[PDB]
Design a protein around this ligand. Structure first.
Ligand code: CMP
Ligand code: CMP
Lengths: 225, 224
């Protein structure tokens, strides 16, 4: 239910359960339709969001119109915190990939919570560190891996985040377009298409809409690195 | 003369000088010779560092052995926090470019600090948040900036960090080998040498061993 999903967000881990239930209760429930923009990169804001259902992509923009997708968040994930702790523009656009349900609060509310519960501040440090940890790997990936290996990685990352076991395989209803997968990878639409085709062609994965079955993890794993 | 250099670290910014002064004194010092590894990528860490003197490069490693440098840290810079707040292995090596002196603390001392002083907590959050903002930009530069644009950016970052006025021009004693420079930029030595020679052929920059003089910053800044 909504309170169990919210209770799993990093920001509440090990924190007093009671304080958690009460804090959840002062959060606002919102719902966005698919494709809605929650905020744009460069906007100022200090609202924070914790998703309870659906997927939100976080997009950054190059002067020439193009975009890379930093990541795709889903239920229990948090975004919006960064502008609070380092005041400044949104470091990306948050856009609903599906219909999205989230809990949200302003930064006054968050600050008061932290003042009542220092453990929150500690969990927030773990959250930003873990994000530096992941993003550093993405950067390494751009420096050291070829496009096909990067595509492979991206897919295994989607599988770990959103994958279901389905008749021996990983069902990954990622809901992304072809171009968006590419933006997630940080490479051209053609190369990324090429690699994807290759991987289907070998039987490693199976395309089927904005969804992928991943049937030999290890082969795809071998190909990344 | 360690106290003042340390008080210039991000973790203490705006924090009370006497609370800063008191906290500095629980920090434990270490010294390393030139070329030493303080710690390796994948090592489990428990220790935080703030450099008081000299330079540290933070490197990542591909299985086939090649290296990339995330950044170069000097006096006042803080590293090793990531493993403390997200327990897990080191996200890079730390290697001594020059002889390095540093103040350190382990994770139990830092948790105390974070739990006892909201302002230090706040500062740390600000430090990680700003590192995210910066890394995002690096990652975008890889995808969208041309190689010589990156060199230009890497030079000015070095100048922004270690630049000292000289002859109306910026003197930048970075202490790096061309390979290291290339590895900071994160591109083939061929491309990074060729872009360095160009800016020279002009007169934006002059090479000298492991030191650069940036004469006209304006145009270098422009080239980013
Ligand atoms: N590299 C990243 N990895 C994961 N999340 C990020 C990353 N960069 C930014 N974000 C999230 O994207 C949000 C965009 O708005 P803020 O900058 O307010 O806060 C940002 C973070 O919550
Ligand atoms: N993107 C980054 N920007 C600045 N410093 C970093 C970055 N990534 C890692 N580091 C520093 O390098 C240190 C390596 O050890 P830790 O992972 O514990 O902590 C890391 C950070 O202190």
């Amino acid at each position: 239910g909504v309170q169990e999903i919210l209770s799993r967000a990093g920001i509440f881990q090990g924190v007093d359960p009671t304080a958690v239930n009460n804090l959840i209760q002062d959060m606002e429930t919102v719902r966005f339709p698919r494709g809605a923009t929650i905020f744009d990169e460069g906007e100022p804001g200090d609202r924070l969001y914790i998703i309870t259902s659906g997927k939100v992509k976080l997009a950054r923009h190059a002067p020439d119109g193009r975009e890379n997708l930093l990541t795709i968040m889903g239920p229990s994930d948090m975004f919006g915190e960064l502008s609070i702790f380092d005041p400044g523009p949104r470091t990306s656009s948050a856009v609903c990939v599906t219909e999205v349900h989230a809990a949200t609060m302003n930064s006054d509310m968050l600050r008061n919570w932290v003042a009542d519960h220092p453990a929150i501040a500690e969990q927030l440090l773990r959250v930003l560190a873990r994000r530096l940890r992941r993003t550093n790997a993405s950067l390494a990936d751009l420096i050291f891996t070829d496009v096909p290996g990067r595509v492979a990685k991206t897919l295994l990352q989607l599988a770990n985040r959103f994958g279901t076991q389905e008749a021996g395989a990983l069902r990954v209803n990622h809901d992304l377009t072809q171009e968006e997968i590419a933006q997630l990878v940080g490479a051209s639409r053609e190369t990324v298409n090429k690699a994807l085709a290759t991987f289907a062609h070998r039987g490693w994965i199976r395309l089927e809409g904005k969804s992928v079955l991943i049937v030999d993890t290890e082969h795809l794993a071998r190909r990344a690195r």
